[PDB]
Amino acid sequence: MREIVHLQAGQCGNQIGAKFWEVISDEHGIDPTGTYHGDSDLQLERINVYYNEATGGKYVPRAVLVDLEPGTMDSVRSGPFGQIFRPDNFVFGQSGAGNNWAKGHYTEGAELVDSVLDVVRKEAESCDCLQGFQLTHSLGGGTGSGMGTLLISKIREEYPDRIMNTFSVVPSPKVSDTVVEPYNATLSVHQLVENTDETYCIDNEALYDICFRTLKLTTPTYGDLNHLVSATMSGVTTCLRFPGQLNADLRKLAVNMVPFPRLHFFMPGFAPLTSRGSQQYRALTVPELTQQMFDAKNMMAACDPRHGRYLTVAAVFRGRMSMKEVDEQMLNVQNKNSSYFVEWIPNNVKTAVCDIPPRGLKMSATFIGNSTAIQELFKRISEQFTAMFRRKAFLHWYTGEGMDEMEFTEAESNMNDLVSEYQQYQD
Amino acid sequence: MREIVHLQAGQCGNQIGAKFWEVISDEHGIDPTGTYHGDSDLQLERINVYYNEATGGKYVPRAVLVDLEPGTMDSVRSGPFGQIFRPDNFVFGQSGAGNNWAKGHYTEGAELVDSVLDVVRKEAESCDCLQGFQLTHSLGGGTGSGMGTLLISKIREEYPDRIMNTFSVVPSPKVSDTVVEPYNATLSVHQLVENTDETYCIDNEALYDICFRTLKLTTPTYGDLNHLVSATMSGVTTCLRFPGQLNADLRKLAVNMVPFPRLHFFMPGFAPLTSRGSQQYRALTVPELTQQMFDAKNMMAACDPRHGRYLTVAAVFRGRMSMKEVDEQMLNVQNKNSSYFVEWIPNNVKTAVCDIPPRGLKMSATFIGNSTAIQELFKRISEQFTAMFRRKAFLHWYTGEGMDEMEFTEAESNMNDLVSEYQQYQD
Amino acid sequence: LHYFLCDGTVEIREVLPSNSGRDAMSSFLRRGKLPKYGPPGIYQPGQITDRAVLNVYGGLSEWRADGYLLDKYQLGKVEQDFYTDQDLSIGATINVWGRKVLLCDCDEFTKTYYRTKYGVDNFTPISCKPPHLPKIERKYPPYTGFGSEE
Amino acid sequence: PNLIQRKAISGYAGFVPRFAWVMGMNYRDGV
Amino acid sequence: MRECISIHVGQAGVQIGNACWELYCLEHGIQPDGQMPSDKTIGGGDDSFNTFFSETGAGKHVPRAVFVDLEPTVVDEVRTGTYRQLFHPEQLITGKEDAANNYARGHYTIGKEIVDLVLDRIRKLADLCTGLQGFLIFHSFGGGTGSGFASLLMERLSVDYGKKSKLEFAIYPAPQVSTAVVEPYNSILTTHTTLEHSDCAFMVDNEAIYDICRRNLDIERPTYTNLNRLIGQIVSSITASLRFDGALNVDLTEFQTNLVPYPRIHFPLATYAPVISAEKAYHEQLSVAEITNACFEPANQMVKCDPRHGKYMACCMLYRGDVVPKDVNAAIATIKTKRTIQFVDWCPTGFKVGINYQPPTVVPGGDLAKVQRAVCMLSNTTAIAEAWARLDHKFDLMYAKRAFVHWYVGEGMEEGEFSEAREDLAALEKDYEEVGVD
Numbered sequence A, B: 001m002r003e004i005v006h007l008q009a010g011q012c013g014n015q016i017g018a019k020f021w022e023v024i025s026d027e028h029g030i031d032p033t034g035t036y037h038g039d040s041d042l043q044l045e046r047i048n049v050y051y052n053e054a055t056g057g058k059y060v061p062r063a064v065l066v067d068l069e070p071g072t073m074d075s076v077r078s079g080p081f082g083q084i085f086r087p088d089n090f091v092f093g094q095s096g097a098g099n100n101w102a103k104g105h106y107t108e109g110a111e112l113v114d115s116v117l118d119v120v121r122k123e124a125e126s127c128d129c130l131q132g133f134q135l136t137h138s139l140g141g142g143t144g145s146g147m148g149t150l151l152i153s154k155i156r157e158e159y160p161d162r163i164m165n166t167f168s169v170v171p172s173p174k175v176s177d178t179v180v181e182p183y184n185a186t187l188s189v190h191q192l193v194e195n196t197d198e199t200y201c202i203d204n205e206a207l208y209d210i211c212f213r214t215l216k217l218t219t220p221t222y223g224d225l226n227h228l229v230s231a232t233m234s235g236v237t238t239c240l241r242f243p244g245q246l247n248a249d250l251r252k253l254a255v256n257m258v259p260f261p262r263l264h265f266f267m268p269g270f271a272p273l274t275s276r277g278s279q280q281y282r283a284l285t286v287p288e289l290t291q292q293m294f295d296a297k298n299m300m301a302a303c304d305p306r307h308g309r310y311l312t313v314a315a316v317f318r319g320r321m322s323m324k325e326v327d328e329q330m331l332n333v334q335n336k337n338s339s340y341f342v343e344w345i346p347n348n349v350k351t352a353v354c355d356i357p358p359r360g361l362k363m364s365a366t367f368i369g370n371s372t373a374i375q376e377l378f379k380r381i382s383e384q385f386t387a388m389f390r391r392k393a394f395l396h397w398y399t400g401e402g403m404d405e406m407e408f409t410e411a412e413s414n415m416n417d418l419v420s421e422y423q424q425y426q427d
Numbered sequence C: 001l002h003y004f005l006c007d008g009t010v011e012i013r014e015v016l017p018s019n020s021g022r023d024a025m026s027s028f029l030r031r032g033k034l035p036k037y038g039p040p041g042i043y044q045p046g047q048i049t050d051r052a053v054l055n056v057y058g059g060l061s062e063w064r065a066d067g068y069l070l071d072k073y074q075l076g077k078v079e080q081d082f083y084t085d086q087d088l089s090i091g092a093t094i095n096v097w098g099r100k101v102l103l104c105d106c107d108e109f110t111k112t113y114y115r116t117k118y119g120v121d122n123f124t125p126i127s128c129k130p131p132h133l134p135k136i137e138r139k140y141p142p143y144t145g146f147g148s149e150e
Numbered sequence D: 001p002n003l004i005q006r007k008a009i010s011g012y013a014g015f016v017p018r019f020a021w022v023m024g025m026n027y028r029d030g031v
Numbered sequence E: 001m002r003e004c005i006s007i008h009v010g011q012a013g014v015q016i017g018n019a020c021w022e023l024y025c026l027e028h029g030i031q032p033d034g035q036m037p038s039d040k041t042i043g044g045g046d047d048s049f050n051t052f053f054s055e056t057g058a059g060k061h062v063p064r065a066v067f068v069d070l071e072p073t074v075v076d077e078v079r080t081g082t083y084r085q086l087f088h089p090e091q092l093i094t095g096k097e098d099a100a101n102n103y104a105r106g107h108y109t110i111g112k113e114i115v116d117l118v119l120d121r122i123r124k125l126a127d128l129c130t131g132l133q134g135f136l137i138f139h140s141f142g143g144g145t146g147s148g149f150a151s152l153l154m155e156r157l158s159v160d161y162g163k164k165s166k167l168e169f170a171i172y173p174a175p176q177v178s179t180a181v182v183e184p185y186n187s188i189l190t191t192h193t194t195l196e197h198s199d200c201a202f203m204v205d206n207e208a209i210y211d212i213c214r215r216n217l218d219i220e221r222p223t224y225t226n227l228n229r230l231i232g233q234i235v236s237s238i239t240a241s242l243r244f245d246g247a248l249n250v251d252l253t254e255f256q257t258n259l260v261p262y263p264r265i266h267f268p269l270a271t272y273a274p275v276i277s278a279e280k281a282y283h284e285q286l287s288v289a290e291i292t293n294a295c296f297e298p299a300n301q302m303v304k305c306d307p308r309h310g311k312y313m314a315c316c317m318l319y320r321g322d323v324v325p326k327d328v329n330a331a332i333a334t335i336k337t338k339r340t341i342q343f344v345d346w347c348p349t350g351f352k353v354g355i356n357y358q359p360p361t362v363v364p365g366g367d368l369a370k371v372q373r374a375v376c377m378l379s380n381t382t383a384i385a386e387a388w389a390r391l392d393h394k395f396d397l398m399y400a401k402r403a404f405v406h407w408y409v410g411e412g413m414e415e416g417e418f419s420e421a422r423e424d425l426a427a428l429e430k431d432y433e434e435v436g437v438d
Ligand SMILES: Nc1nc2c(ncn2[C@@H]2O[C@H](COP(=O)(O)OP(=O)(O)OP(=O)(O)O)[C@@H](O)[C@H]2O)c(=O)[nH]1
Pocket: A009, A010, A011, A012, A013, A014, A015, A097, A098, A099, A100, A137, A138, A140, A141, A142, A143, A144, A145, A146, A177, A178, A222
């Protein structure tokens, strides 16, 4: 049977797996101790897509955690579910990254790739047959970009036949906090576009806007935002676990999703975002869902695809729905914006229906999109790269590491090619 | 009936045995006083193979304890089980060793060999029909190698038809403490290769690593370190004492292990080694046993056979198993690393399954290995022996005792003979 | 345990000794709050807050971080009782996120603290470590006295 | 006394009386 | 079994011994009267004392030693001390006349009529003992009576007994300090005589012992009591293996068989790492690493020698206290990786480790620290030849102008023996670079 091994990298990958995993454990009803509390047979039939078995009714997660700063792990370990996490799974380092990509890609990665490869192959042999792997990290996160680029490059040759699912958060457009972050991102995306097959794109001001727009609660914790995106990651994975006539395999989703190889960067979409009075002011109907589904405000990925057009779109519906409402909703929306799609391909909606609602809500959904709205993202970073490479600011470090400006030349040359690549197909 | 009488030699074997017999005592359930508490019939059945009954429900261990220093022998008699050891079997000397090989081989041995031969033949007549003997000692041990080389020679002619099981520990490669130990080891091995049939090779450095790897308790005791190794030969002896569909005789085993006469050096291998929380974090399954069972980190004897190749391999399995999982595991490992074995012999695996698990754990196994990894050991001593012989350092003692360099000539020349022979067979 | 009177929160650490066969991490718990019972059903985060704003007039333009028009009724408050200072006495039952635990000793100030709080005074230590058994003694072989008795 | 006069912080560069007469011991005891 | 006999020549070597039985009686709890409390340790004399004392049926712990001196003043004074009832009267072999700092006078004029009596002492101690591993000799090179008198007795005990060990402990002559100008005279007379008979001669120098006092012990005005206490601790550490046990137990026979490379040279160096004050131990911590760094620090040896001017041959360390081999073998491994450390390529391994569980004890009225982990570091190196190099250029000057010869030639000596020592010495240096040259 086909299972999945998870990778959490970077200190946001450390953020995310914690919230991502507890939602899953809470979803299936396992206590923090590990003694599963049997209530649903359907969650009792597909735990081995993600979890292996331990003695005493314990479900061992098949995730490998890697970082450098122990206090992150100590917080991660001392959390609600660190006991369900393995000290076996805790691989780390003796140095501080300095949040330097070159360090994490050449210097400390050199002596840590051996450990993680042994850990993953031990875990790979622990399980039978894989769909693939997913990685939670950041493209602008220096440790996450450091190991991830190495790891995704490594996992390719041993297993070039599986899913290289990637989950990276796009840094803040207005202020990157880290000033060398644009340098870090440009380096990674060069290898990322080459090594990956699928990419998740996430931004926090969109989440911050969502926090303002519908959450309406002024001050959340970053974990609350982590819950929002973990729900997105849950929904896309609920497809594989749950029964109901919907085609779940990521390949099944991917081959319907990507017409040309260079398309890996895709944007999410989620299901009812509800404010304080509107939980009991809402008549949860597929129309008002579908209305809220295709809301540019309900978007959370990067920025409005209003600027561009829609290449491929795929939505999965979770709950007690039927084939007809989803069908007419497309028949509605398709006529609503017929021109906003590309004349290249018609009938670009990819629909799957999960009959198993989440715990606490009946009619939910998820959306994954590939529209012509990524240009400004790497166009934004293009001016940043050109300006700081114009006078090579903050460059003396990477030269001391052993890097050179030539690497930057092909890196931007590739990205500029992706600019035309995206521009030419739509425009 | 077919039985075994043990020999406790050298001051290390003094710790080796002390832990070794109490491991025998508690597994069978006898109190320290010696009054067995009847709990298991099978251990009650197969206790005669090593013990004799005296009056009052007391099993006398059938061994001989030999030393020169009273105090170490004082420590063990004052030990928790010194009462179960015989003042009759306590033989010793009035002299100090000087940690000198020659003194215990020609000077001190001469007046002690007579008495120890009397005691063992008294013990030999006490029993009916022995399979053979086993000896705990060290090759680099000052008096143990001194006494061992003499006794192994003498036991050859009296009973040339039995099992001359030998158990010796290899000193630490980084430091031998004793600096004339290379002389002591080289002197011993010259006669060891001549007389022995089976030899176990043990090194504390890898054992020191094991504490850092799975014991994870920072500061152990050498008795706990004995507790580690005491499990090893106990496992191979469980096959003899325990029932179940597996062949027990070492002759059944040794002929399966020894293709050519000069093969006496064999390495141990143990099964699940568990750490802080992995007891309740481990799902005990034959596959996960097997992988850890074949781990270079699980190797404890000398060094990594990664540098060399595998001549003969044998793992005995203790617990509630079946013939099919061990069969597929052998098929699995056969396909995994087929080139790493020698094309000389295919299907070089020998397996036995003991249906009687240990006391406390269910799934367990023990491994004996004869791989091509011993080369590095005796090249190390090769330059060690030559350099100190290149200017005959520390030699005036042995000339004073009556030893001459001509003895050293053939000892290394035969050692050089074993170098090529192990090399030639594999390379 | 470490209950904090400034935030009404608790913390848990471990006293594992040498050769314990356990990690060096001390704080087995966060410094947060302990729900009165086992794992609470996750209340669909997205409404797990305290205050209730009604409408935002901010998105109209950009002056501040938008306008916060509050409410007056504060509905949707879901009940989450927490382990407060009330249930503190030597000998009790507590479920710590799934840990059915007991209570047997207090440090130094709780004595003074508890007398002040309501009125309580009877504070006695309770053994939580396992009881110990001795090593009995030794006897000696029967003697026929063939010679001097000693 | 102040903080500690019984023993005064060895390496105590400032002088003390009784630098002569009864000597032949450690720092603290003589002080 | 496991016992030896201890010998003390010259009033220099007697106060240094007095402390050690004062010390040795402390860890054993020996009351000054001569008996234990109502607690039962007396018997046929077989307990912790059976290696050190002779607590026979009389119940009085009798030290297994003979003090030999030529001037009654000091030996009478200790005979009026506190433990005088313990000591055997005529084991305290006294004399009425001195050796006048003369090597030969104590070796010829008076030693003949006194050796017979002490020969009677040793045999009557030889018969009672059983294991008799060897002897413990405290003496001195610049000895007015220690030098000459020990030389003859060592010759006599060598010829009748050549199968057991002889441990020689002496204060080495101060390199730049000389309380007597005839000290080089008798000193080389000892060395050339002892080169072919002595088994293991270990040395120490008082100046560096004092240097330690005000460096880390912080004592600018110590006394003999503390120096005697320090060396008494040193011999206590080496004898701790005899009393207690450990992870491994080592004997002096191992020490001899594993330290000396070749005949003649048998002169290593001793060092004790945790030499610190009480308050320093109070607010700090001790572990194997720093003390291993401490014992190998060039300013901590009691001999004015720089190892970087020599090369290392042997190292014997006696870890006494609570310790595990893990950090020990790791720490010494780092020591092997060190580049400044200069062993000869002849020895890939040179480390003789002794583990003892018993924590070293403080002494009442003492100045040491509260030690849990301790080591005596026994090492031999090639940086030692400068000491005899200092001696010869010192000696060759006075010999050419033959000062004080009338004193020795007056009492019956001649020059040929003085002639022997110089090439006997010159043999000693030339060997040292020959073994020094790889
Ligand atoms: N844990 C945590 N991470 C955050 C938070 N907000 C943003 N992040 C981001 O998560 C990113 C990725 O984490 P890592 O890949 O582990 O970062 P790194 O390589 O260790 O180094 P830096 O990114 O420079 O901190 C960081 O760059 C942060 O910018 C937050 O609130 N909590």
